[PDB]
Design a binder for this molecule. Structure first.
Ligand SMILES: *[C@@H]1O[C@H](CO)[C@@H](O)[C@H](O)[C@H]1NC(C)=O
Ligand SMILES: *[C@@H]1O[C@H](CO)[C@@H](O)[C@H](O)[C@H]1NC(C)=O
Ligand SMILES: *[C@@H]1O[C@H](CO)[C@@H](O)[C@H](O)[C@H]1NC(C)=O
Lengths: 151, 140, 123, 50, 50
């Protein structure tokens, strides 16, 4: 059987943050669509490398006529604020036989796929995934900033 | 054990067995004034507990398992089952809470035009969950 | 689907109290019929017993202070599959008898979220 | 000569009618919430429990 | 969240007069609530609440 495999790397290179701990940030995967396993697949990973690689593997899959499997990845940092904050994963069959990868950039509290009746609905933004899924901190507020200061 | 808390270091002012040397699952606090306690042993055995002097008038006490929610009543220095509510086989009780007692401020939630909706104050309530497989039905 | 309802002394026996039947007439609507209710002298604190042969047997599902002018609304509770799920009793002033209602779970909101707009593609 | 008091009284009417009856009336039910009685439900039971 | 109200009508104290009624819970002649419920969308998985 053929499986999926998530590849990804949070950068921490545009940032100069290198005194981070790497144990307080966790990516998590969930399955929603067209699953026959009597429980949707789920997983949780930690980092792999100083430059920040993270990876899921042995992913179950649907197979046949453009058979889709909807995964969702939760980019978060408990020390930073990650700009994506939600990721869609789309895993369809090619008629050629290969399995096509597509991901999208949702945000907290919107529908993922349109509501099956809107004619010509809006489509979510895809992201270049040739090297890997590239998650990033917020450009403008990289730090989580728990501490409110007086004044 | 009965332990004396003092500004000095404590002292173990008593050690003793319970009435039956059985393994205990939990203890539920009965009345402060009457100095009673209820002990639930694993094997699901309930013991009334008259500890010490500490030197109709019904009491109701209620306990939960994943098999069900049961309820219990104490009278005449004895415990009796008062009813039972078990979920069925496929089902499993998941989450439970009782009503914490509350000192009362306002008997009703108001509206803009000084109008009042009278929030519901009944003290004898608990709430709970049931999750059933294949139904995929969180029941509250 | 016949239910038998009986109060018990919990030491002597379960003395019968009534009989009801549950029919699924429509596609998705069950209903209760009172085939017969057998009222005798009732006064004081009693534990209830409910049994549908086959599916259900709730031996001690409730405990109330009962009186012979039975003035209760008997909520039997069902779910999407037409199967009895629970049996319980509340007080309603207007019956002067036992009348039973079947109940569906009063489905929860599934409250809303932001939706994708309608042709925000060329507009 | 009682015209002066009849005339002046309605000027007491106008403020109470127009502004003090904006939200500041006694005798409507929302003013007795501090004085509302504490409903007694059990009165002979405790219900200690877990 | 579910919030429990005596009457969903804007102004009604349903069967809560307390001067000397002294309701009995054991018997089951208590009032029964009406309820209103909503839910919310939350970012992170919740272990436990108090
Ligand atoms: C799931 O499978 C059904 C067919 O069983 C199909 O109609 C549907 O589009 C698939 N995807 C989702 C998200 O339901
Ligand atoms: C995939 O989709 C194309 C769309 O034209 C369809 O013709 C083909 O049958 C589908 N099959 C597979 C195996 O992906
Ligand atoms: C064969 O699969 C590749 C991707 O693996 C795809 O780009 C190509 O279009 C497929 N061939 C045809 C004839 O569509």
């Amino acid at each position: 059987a053929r499986r999926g495999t998530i590849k990804g790397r949070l950068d921490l290179a545009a940032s100069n943050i290198t005194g981070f701990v790497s144990t307080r940030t966790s990516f998590k995967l969930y399955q929603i669509g067209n699953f026959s396993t009597e429980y949707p697949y789920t997983s949780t990973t930690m980092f792999q490398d100083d430059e920040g690689n993270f990876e899921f593997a042995n992913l179950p899959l649907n197979d046949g006529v453009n058979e889709t499997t909807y995964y969702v990845m939760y980019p978060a940092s408990m020390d930073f604020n990650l700009k994506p904050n939600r990721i869609l994963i789309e895993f369809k069959n090619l008629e050629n036989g290969t399995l096509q990868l597509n991901a999208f950039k949702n945000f907290f509290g919107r529908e993922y796929f349109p509501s099956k009746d809107i004619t010509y609905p809006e489509k979510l933004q895809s992201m270049k995934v040739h090297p890997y899924i590239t998650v990033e901190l917020l450009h403008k507020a990289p730090i989580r900033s728990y501490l409110q200061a007086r004044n | 054990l009965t332990i004396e808390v003092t500004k000095d270091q404590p002292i173990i002012k008593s050690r003793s067995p319970l009435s039956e040397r059985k393994t205990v699952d939990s203890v539920i606090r009965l009345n402060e004034h009457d100095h009673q306690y209820l002990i639930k042993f694993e094997d699901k055995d309930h013991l009334l507990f008259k500890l010490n002097p500490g030197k109709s008038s019904h009491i109701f006490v209620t306990e939960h398992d994943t098999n069900g929610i049961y309820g219990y009543i104490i009278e005449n220095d004895t415990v009796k089952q008062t009813w039972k509510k078990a979920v069925n086989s496929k089902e499993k009780m998941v989450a439970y809470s009782k009503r914490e007692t509350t000192n009362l401020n306002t008997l009703g939630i108001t509206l803009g035009d000084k109008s009042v909706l009278y929030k519901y104050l009944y003290p004898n309530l608990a709430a709970y969950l049931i999750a059933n497989e294949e139904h995929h039905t969180i029941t509250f | 689907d016949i239910l038998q309802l009986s109060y018990s002394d919990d030491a002597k026996d379960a003395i019968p109290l009534g009989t009801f039947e549950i029919d699924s007439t429509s596609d998705g609507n069950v209903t209760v019929t009172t085939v017969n209710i057998q009222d005798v002298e009732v006064s004081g604190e009693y534990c209830l017993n409910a049994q549908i042969e086959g599916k259900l047997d709730m031996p001690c599902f409730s405990y109330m202070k009962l009186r012979t002018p039975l003035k209760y609304d008997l909520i039997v509770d069902v779910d999407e599959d037409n199967e009895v799920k629970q049996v319980s009793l509340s007080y309603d002033e207007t019956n002067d008898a036992i009348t039973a209602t079947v109940r569906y779970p009063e489905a929860g909101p599934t409250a809303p979220v932001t939706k994708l707009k309608k042709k925000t593609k060329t507009y | 000569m009682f015209m002066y008091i009849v005339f002046q009284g309605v000027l007491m009417y106008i403020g109470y009618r127009k502004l003090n009856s904006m939200g500041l009336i006694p005798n409507a039910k929302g003013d007795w919430l501090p004085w509302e009685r504490i409903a007694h439900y059990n009165n002979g039971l405790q219900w200690f429990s877990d | 969240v579910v919030e429990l109200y005596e009457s969903l009508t804007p102004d009604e104290r349903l069967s809560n007069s307390s001067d000397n009624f002294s309701y009995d819970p054991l018997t089951g002649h208590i009032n029964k609530p009406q309820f209103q419920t909503k839910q919310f969308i939350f970012p992170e998985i919740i272990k436990t609440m108090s």
